[PDB]
Design a protein around this ligand. Sequence first.
Ligand SMILES: Cc1cccc(O)c1
Ligand SMILES: Cc1cccc(O)c1
Ligand SMILES: Cc1cccc(O)c1
Ligand SMILES: Cc1cccc(O)c1
Ligand SMILES: Cc1cccc(O)c1
Ligand SMILES: Cc1cccc(O)c1
Ligand SMILES: Cc1cccc(O)c1
Ligand SMILES: [Cl-]
Ligand SMILES: [Cl-]
Ligand code: NA
Ligand SMILES: [Zn+2]
Ligand SMILES: [Zn+2]
Lengths: 29, 29, 29, 30, 29, 29, 21, 21, 21, 21, 21, 21
Amino acid sequence: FVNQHLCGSHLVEALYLVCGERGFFYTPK
Amino acid sequence: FVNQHLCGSHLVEALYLVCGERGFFYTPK
Amino acid sequence: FVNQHLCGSHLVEALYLVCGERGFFYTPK
Amino acid sequence: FVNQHLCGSHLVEALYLVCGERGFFYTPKT
Amino acid sequence: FVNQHLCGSHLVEALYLVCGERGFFYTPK
Amino acid sequence: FVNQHLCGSHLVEALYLVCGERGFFYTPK
Amino acid sequence: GIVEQCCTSICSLYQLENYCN
Amino acid sequence: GIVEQCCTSICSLYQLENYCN
Amino acid sequence: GIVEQCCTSICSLYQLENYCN
Amino acid sequence: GIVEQCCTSICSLYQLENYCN
Amino acid sequence: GIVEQCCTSICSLYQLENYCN
Amino acid sequence: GIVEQCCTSICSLYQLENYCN
Ligand SMILES: Cc1cccc(O)c1
Ligand SMILES: Cc1cccc(O)c1
Ligand SMILES: Cc1cccc(O)c1
Ligand SMILES: Cc1cccc(O)c1
Ligand SMILES: Cc1cccc(O)c1
Ligand SMILES: Cc1cccc(O)c1
Ligand SMILES: Cc1cccc(O)c1
Ligand SMILES: [Cl-]
Ligand SMILES: [Cl-]
Ligand code: NA
Ligand SMILES: [Zn+2]
Ligand SMILES: [Zn+2]
């Protein structure tokens, strides 16, 4: 639902910063 | 490079929205 | 309502991306 | 260009906050 | 809570804009 | 260009994440 | 409108495009 | 704090300005 | 346009208010 | 997944790192 | 990579789709 | 200041902690 959708947008930003050069895969499920 | 860092942050948010349930991979490498 | 405020912030950014050169009106009401 | 694209993304968020309940109109047309 | 975490992320961006040259302190406690 | 404004916008969100409950201080100096 | 429709359940980008000018 | 004060009811710009330096 | 007016130099709150509905 | 794990309760930076490539 | 391809010049949402998995 | 130190060369999350309270 929308809450999970909003949370996910912030999660990918955090991963971007935390993972740096390593990169990351984002799998919502 | 900070300009690339900033661009990357926006790219990740664009990918999150465009890919949806499919998810995406962000490998800046 | 703050939840709606936060939802809107994200809607606005998605519209910016999806609408492109067409632009958009954000009319909460 | 990319710079204007990045700038615009922030402009819409500033307009969202500035305008509040009134809402706003965003057009990148020169 | 995550809702609080999400709300805070937006609050700091709003403070960044409203405070301008004055800057601000974000003290969640 | 508004590069310094854009940079600060991202710095603030990164500080929010990095600093947690300690919070942070943002001064555009 | 957009709020009633998209804050309640997830709108796809296609659905959001409806609100474009 | 600002969280308790602005995360349920929307704070106006003036209310936010109270947290500026 | 707004990008021309606000992306080279920063726009004031008053200048951004021009675009509110 | 990361949603289930981190959208109910807050994940630290260290825990998010668990999801990096 | 996506950086070289999309930060040097703008990528359409259609081009960004290449990075969905 | 943080702008002088972090807006040309990327500050590591480690470096950014210098600006925490
Ligand atoms: C992209 C987006 C943001 C917020 C709500 C939605 O339904 C969709
Ligand atoms: C602008 C803003 C963001 C988050 C909560 C608020 O009350 C106000
Ligand atoms: C990106 C941005 C935000 C606010 C004012 C501006 O002129 C530009
Ligand atoms: C940084 C962050 C964002 C969203 C959810 C989390 O648990 C953590
Ligand atoms: C949507 C988006 C963000 C940043 C760069 C791009 O080319 C495209
Ligand atoms: C390129 C693209 C992807 C998804 C929805 C759209 O309206 C456009
Ligand atoms: C995380 C971040 C944002 C902006 C500039 C930096 O050096 C680092
Ligand atoms: Cl949110
Ligand atoms: Cl930016
Ligand atoms: Na690895
Ligand atoms: Zn940006
Ligand atoms: Zn949010």
